């Protein structure tokens, strides 16, 4: 069937799938933040790092994903060019904050697993709070400084028209921004996470497997969600017209979804498990 109505169905069908994602992203992180904020037994260094990730993921399905839903289903932009400039800046700021924090929990956790005596003495709260400031300082620098200041802008006529058009909100970057930002937001944190969980797997070698299944869920769900999108960013930088917007957006949305997983991966502690149910009016 192909009329002028069969389209207004796949739209409502995609439209509710998006509204699940947006809720799952919010619910999971509003629960994780309140858990750490209300329960004392959850005030660990590693948990300060779960928090920074939980605010990064909450802002995804709060300011980015909802507008993402719109722009797509609207099949256009209804917020103007400065709000386009702004929204694009949140998008990058949150993706960098999500991925940096994922790799900061990674180094931290390996340091405590490998050397718990150095960690206990060295990594303070007033050291950890400072790690987090830096995470958001770069996140900001890679997002608001180059997008907002026009340092990201493309030069080809197609983009020049889009940048001028208030109903246009297609992201067009110059060969260098896309590479530089991809290395900062993703590959550096990927490399770090690769060799950090590498030394966890190696120094370790029944109980050995179900715990090693874990760093497999961790490193996996992360790659399975962000490597597709970022390898495509590099391919599209080299060979122009080799990636379809259909594909590029579909790939970004997979990563947008990772933000909903993080609560399920990082908050599996028995104290989280206890905290969550008490808040969900089950315990006590």
């Amino acid at each position: 069937d192909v009329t002028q109505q069969r389209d207004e169905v796949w739209v409502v069908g995609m439209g509710i799938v998006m509204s699940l994602i947006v809720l799952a992203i919010v619910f999971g992180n509003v629960l994780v933040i309140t858990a750490i904020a209300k329960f004392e037994r959850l005030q660990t260094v590693t948990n300060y790092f779960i928090t920074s990730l939980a605010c990064a993921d909450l802002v995804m399905g709060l300011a980015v994903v909802p507008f993402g839903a719109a722009h797509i289903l609207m099949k256009m932009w209804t917020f103007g060019n400065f709000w386009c400039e702004f929204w694009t800046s949140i998008d990058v700021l949150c993706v960098t904050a999500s991925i940096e924090t994922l790799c900061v929990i990674a180094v931290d956790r390996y340091f405590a697993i490998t050397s718990p005596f150095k960690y206990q003495s060295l990594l303070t709260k007033n050291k950890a709070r400072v790690i987090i400031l830096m995470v958001w300082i770069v996140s900001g620098l890679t997002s608001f400084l180059p997008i907002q200041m026009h340092w990201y802008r493309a030069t080809h006529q197609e983009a020049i028209n889009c940048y001028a058009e208030e109903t246009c909100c297609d992201f067009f970057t110059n060969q260098a921004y896309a590479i530089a930002s991809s290395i900062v937001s993703f590959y550096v944190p990927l490399v770090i996470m690769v060799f950090v969980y590498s030394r966890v797997f190696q120094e370790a070698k029944l109980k050995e497997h179900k715990a090693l299944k874990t760093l497999g869920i961790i490193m996996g769900t992360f790659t399975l969600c962000w490597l597709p999108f970022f390898i495509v960013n590099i391919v599209h930088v080299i060979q122009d017209n080799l990636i379809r917007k259909e594909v590029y957006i579909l790939l970004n949305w997979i990563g947008y979804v990772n933000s909903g997983f993080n609560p399920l991966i990082y908050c599996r502690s028995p104290d989280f498990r206890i905290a969550f149910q008490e808040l969900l009016c089950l315990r006590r």
């Epitope: 590693t46 956790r109 090693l212 874990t214």
Partner: nanobody, 119 residues
Framework: VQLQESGGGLVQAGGSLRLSCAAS????????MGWYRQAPGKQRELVAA???????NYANSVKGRFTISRDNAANTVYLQMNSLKPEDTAVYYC??????????????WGQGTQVTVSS
């Protein structure tokens, strides 16, 4: 899985003892087995700990005297307490910290081996 402590009991001051603790069961390859002492109606304080890779953390008071070691075959810890002063009289507990699930540490405790250093 349970922690099987022994070596506890009365001993003359300036004496010696060997506290042993067998972690009966499956415990992940990366872990820290240590000793914790409950002073007469006071707070629990770590005596000495040993990581399953090789590194220590003796509580500065027992440093020089008491010496912690471990077997990675059966997973048993030996705090050889020499020159036992009446300040060392406390309930000693066995404890294993368990890394992997790699994000948090599963804490395993023991019932406690009483040590009474008499003068």
């Amino acid at each position: 899985v349970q922690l099987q402590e022994s070596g506890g009991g009365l001993v003359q001051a300036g004496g010696s003892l060997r506290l042993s603790c067998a972690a009966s069961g499956s415990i992940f390859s990366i872990n820290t087995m240590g000793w914790y002492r409950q002073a007469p109606g006071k707070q629990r304080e770590l005596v000495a700990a040993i990581h399953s890779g090789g590194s220590t953390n003796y509580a500065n008071s027992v440093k020089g005297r008491f010496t912690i070691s471990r077997d990675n075959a059966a997973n048993t810890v030996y705090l050889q307490m020499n020159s036992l002063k009446p300040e060392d009289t406390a309930v000693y507990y066995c404890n294993v910290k368990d890394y992997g699930a790699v994000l948090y540490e599963y804490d395993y405790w023991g019932q406690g081996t009483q040590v009474t250093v008499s003068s």
